[PDB]
Amino acid sequence: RYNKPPYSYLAMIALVIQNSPEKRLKLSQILKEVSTLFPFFNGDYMGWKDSIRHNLSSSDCFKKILKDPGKPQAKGNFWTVDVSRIPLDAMKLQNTALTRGGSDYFVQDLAPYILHNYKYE
DNA sequence: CAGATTGTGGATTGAG
DNA sequence: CTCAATCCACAATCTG
């Protein structure tokens, strides 16, 4: 357990994918857009990059984009979230000891910004 | 071609 | 109890 923002990785990835131009994003583009939106990874640790890559494959919300039907074994494909399938309790703010008080720092729920067309600060 | 990155997924941990 | 976070491993493409 390392210092990460109190939002599930699923909601973090789902946000940057919807906030993107064509609602598709490559792994690297997901990595840097997540890092700047939730600026709590600019330190020494690096394993959070794996956790995101692992979350994309291990969730049925995220699907790949087929570049070439002749090479379906290709990598670097853009990922697309399918918002309707995101459990509503996965977007709420994570109950940790960091959010015992002073919670006014972070929003309570990312559903408006993910599936309701609102702007995240 | 070596080294970096992607995609997958099996297994353990700490915490709620 | 449960489950997100983290670990570590392997396979295979991607890049220069």
Numbering used by the authors: 114 to 234
Copied sentences from the primary study:
To decipher how FoxH1 selects GK sites and how the extended domain contributes to DNA binding, we determined the crystal structures of FoxH1 proteins from three selected species, H. sapiens, D. rerio, and X. laevis, bound to a 16 bp native sequence belonging to the mouse Gsc promoter containing the GG site. The three GG complexes were refined at 0.98 Å (D. rerio, C2 space group), 1.47 Å (H. sapiens, P21 space group), and 2.8 Å resolution (X. laevis, P212121 space group). The root-mean-square deviations (RMSD) between the three vertebrate GG complexes range from 0.47 to 0.65 Å, indicating high structural conservation between the proteins. In the three FoxH1 complexes, Wing2 folds as a series of short α-helical turns. Several differences located in Wing2 and also in the loop preceding H3 reflect the amino acid variations between the three species. In the human and frog sequences, which are longer at the C-terminus, we detected a short coil fragment that turns back and runs antiparallel to H8.
Forkhead box H1 (FoxH1) is an essential maternal pioneer factor during embryonic development that binds to specific GG/GT-containing DNA target sequences. The members of the FOX transcription factor family share the presence of the forkhead domain (FH), which interacts with DNA (InterPro entry IPR001766). Most FOX proteins recognize the canonical forkhead DNA motif TRTTTRY (R = A/G, Y = C/T). In contrast, FoxH1 recognizes the TGTG(G/T)ATT sequences in several cis-regulatory elements, such as in Gsc, Eomes, Nodal, Mixl, and FoxA2, to confer activin regulation in vivo.
